[PDB]
Amino acid sequence: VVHRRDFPQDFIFGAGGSAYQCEGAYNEGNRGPSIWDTFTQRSPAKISDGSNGNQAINCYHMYKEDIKIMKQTGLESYRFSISWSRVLPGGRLAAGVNKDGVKFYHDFIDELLANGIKPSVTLFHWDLPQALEDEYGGFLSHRIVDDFCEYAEFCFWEFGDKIKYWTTFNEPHTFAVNGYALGEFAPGRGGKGDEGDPAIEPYVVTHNILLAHKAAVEEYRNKFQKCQEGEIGIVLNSMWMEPLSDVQADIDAQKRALDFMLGWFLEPLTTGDYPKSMRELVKGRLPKFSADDSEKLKGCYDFIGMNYYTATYVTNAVKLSYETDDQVTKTFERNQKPIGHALYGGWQHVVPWGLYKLLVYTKETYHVPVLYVTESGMVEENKTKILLSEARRDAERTDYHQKHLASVRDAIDDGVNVKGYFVWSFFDNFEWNLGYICRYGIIHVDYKSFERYPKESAIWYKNFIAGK
Ligand SMILES: OC[C@@H]1[C@@H](O)[C@H](O)[C@@H](O)[C@@H]1NCc1ccc(Br)cc1
Numbered sequence: 001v002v003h004r005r006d007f008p009q010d011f012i013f014g015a016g017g018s019a020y021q022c023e024g025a026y027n028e029g030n031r032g033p034s035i036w037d038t039f040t041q042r043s044p045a046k047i048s049d050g051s052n053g054n055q056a057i058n059c060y061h062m063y064k065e066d067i068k069i070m071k072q073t074g075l076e077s078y079r080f081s082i083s084w085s086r087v088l089p090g091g092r093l094a095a096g097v098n099k100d101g102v103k104f105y106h107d108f109i110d111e112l113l114a115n116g117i118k119p120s121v122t123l124f125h126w127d128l129p130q131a132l133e134d135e136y137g138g139f140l141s142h143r144i145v146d147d148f149c150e151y152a153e154f155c156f157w158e159f160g161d162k163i164k165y166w167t168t169f170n171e172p173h174t175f176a177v178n179g180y181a182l183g184e185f186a187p188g189r190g191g192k193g194d195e196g197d198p199a200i201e202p203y204v205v206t207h208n209i210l211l212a213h214k215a216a217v218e219e220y221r222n223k224f225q226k227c228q229e230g231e232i233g234i235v236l237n238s239m240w241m242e243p244l245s246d247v248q249a250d251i252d253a254q255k256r257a258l259d260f261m262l263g264w265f266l267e268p269l270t271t272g273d274y275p276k277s278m279r280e281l282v283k284g285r286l287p288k289f290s291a292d293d294s295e296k297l298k299g300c301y302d303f304i305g306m307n308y309y310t311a312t313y314v315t316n317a318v319k320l321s322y323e324t325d326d327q328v329t330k331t332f333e334r335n336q337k338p339i340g341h342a343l344y345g346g347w348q349h350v351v352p353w354g355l356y357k358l359l360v361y362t363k364e365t366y367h368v369p370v371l372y373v374t375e376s377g378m379v380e381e382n383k384t385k386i387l388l389s390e391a392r393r394d395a396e397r398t399d400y401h402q403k404h405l406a407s408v409r410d411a412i413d414d415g416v417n418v419k420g421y422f423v424w425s426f427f428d429n430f431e432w433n434l435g436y437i438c439r440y441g442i443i444h445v446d447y448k449s450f451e452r453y454p455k456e457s458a459i460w461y462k463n464f465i466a467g468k
Pocket residue numbers: 018170171174237307309375431440
């Protein structure tokens with residue numbers, strides 16, 4: 001019971017992909033390896049099916065077609081990621097600027113704009129140049145801040161006379177947690193039999209990412225914003241955290257669970273310090289900001305993008321690690337009753353109203369002037385063994401998105417300033433440590449032949465975008 005007119009004139013509708021998950025052509029056009037190439041190549045057993053982004057779904061050679069398909073759907077904007085390491089093979093400026101890479105993105109952008117579609121660029125989507133990961137530890141070093149700045153500056157200069165939407169980081173929480181606490185994503189550090197320290201590193205990384213982010217924002221504010229008239233922000237991710245009972249302890253547990261996962265970032269970006277509840281528990285294992293760093297972090301974004309997938313109940317809990325540092329046991333079940341229908345993984349639960357509360361929480365708690373839902377979507381088993389006829393009748397995914405948008409509208413109505421919804425993902429693509437065992441897209445892709453055929457949800461969204 002939700003339509004296009006139910007939303008402001010201002011609102012933007014779109015979908016996204018991200019460089020590693022879509023481009024393929026990992027070793028063409030002089031691209032330099034990312035930690036994710038390396039991860040999947042050296043540690044194939046850490047990928048559900050051994051697969052990798054070598055070809056992914058091959059956007060690098062198929063962009064002209066993909067942009068047709070975007071426009072057949074009516075996409076108002078498309079979010080994509082620049083492979084740091086395709087424009088700068090060795091990460092620093094000294095290693096050179098890859099002109100082939102630089103042409104690709106320009107070709108790609110111009111194609112988008114030639115088609116009425118608004119380009120929207122994430123600077124970092126976890127595909128860090130291996131050359132930097134190796135030289136000084138990647139985000140375990142402060143050295144990452146300036147190199148990131150120089151990358152950032154390069155991109156603004158090179159591409160920005162045509163970009164209005166810059167995002168510095170996607171899901172630093174996921175990047176830092178899965179990467180340095182669970183050892184599950186690149187570089188694979190922290191979890192049992194792995195390499196780092198799951199008690200130390202995730203804090204160091206987030207700490208440097210926020211300083212990277214800072215560096216990039218100022219670079220843009222002071223140097224490009226007035227010229228290119230765009231907006232730079234960051235994209236965070238969170239589950240909604242519901243109190244299991246309605247005793248105190250469970251309300252504190254929600255406050256802590258959100259502090260640790262969201263506040264880990266929003267707080268610095270607000271008051272210039274990590275959440276009280278993180279200082280309490282993490283103590284001297286949490287880095288301090290210098291006087292000057294705190295100050296310059298306050299309101300250091302033009303917008304907050306949010307990736308929501310699901311909600312969980314929380315409660316007080318009973319080896320040191322980020323993982324267990326918020327002191328909260330999480331569960332999908334209240335009295336064996338699941339919080340929402342359980343999708344393929346076991347993990348995504350369809351909870352439309354969690355996006356409502358999450359969006360309200362962020363406005364209310366962190367006073368964010370501008371919010372976008374940057375990533376919303378549902379998972380689907382990659383069932384080999386059924387005809388495409390059947391696979392594309394993803395009735396449920398249409399329904400998933402409606403209920404979601406309906407919760408977004410309700411957030412706008414009750415005060416919250418959301419300006420955009422971006423389906424994830426436009427295309428079925430490579431899903432990190434799960435590789436190709438599942439699908440998120442409104443556009444089916446055959447992982448072998450790369451052929452693209454629209455699902456029903458795509459045809460729904462085409463109508464929905466076109467209502468008023
Ligand atoms: O499906 C996860 C999507 C990826 O495709 C995108 O790269 C990323 O923005 C998004 N992460 C969502 C997510 C993040 C953490 C966990 Br645990 C489960 C899901």
